[PDB]
Design goal:
This protein is an all-alpha fold. It contains four helices and no strands. It folds into two domains: 77 residues, 5' to 3' exonuclease, C-terminal subdomain (DNA polymerase, domain 1); 59 residues, DNA polymerase, domain 1 (Orthogonal Bundle), CATH 1.10.150. This is Transcription termination/antitermination protein NusA.
Amino acid sequence: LSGWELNVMTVDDLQAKHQAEAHAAIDTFTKYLDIDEDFATVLVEEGFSTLEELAYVPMKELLEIEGLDEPTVEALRERAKNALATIAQAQEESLGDNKPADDLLNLEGVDRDLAFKLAARGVCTLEDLAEQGIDDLADIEGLTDEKAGALIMAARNICWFGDEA
């Protein structure tokens, strides 16, 4: 009805979602004023909670913060770089919901590419391959139907026909 993604998750904490998140960000600026601790704190007016579009901001609006020396701005830039790094890490961890473990790369005949493709197909655990047919594991970038069938036979032999755990 609104066209935008609605989110209702919290039940008792972070219930307001606008005031409880305003003054609770100590995990973000855990090392912000690394020169000395008795300098300042992050503000709520600007927010200091974005760390993505805040990397580039002119000096027209940063005067309202008392105690603005060049170590302060250098520590701000260093923390922005560290935030960029941790955000890129969180992205590269969240986008790829595959995680091919050691049991997935131990199959004979699959490199990183085939492992990633079979993990993106929808299966990621060894015991759940026997219930995937030949056409189910088809349309793979770099996998012949005969080779896919043979790998399915090998999987069902090592897991089901082998009778081991």
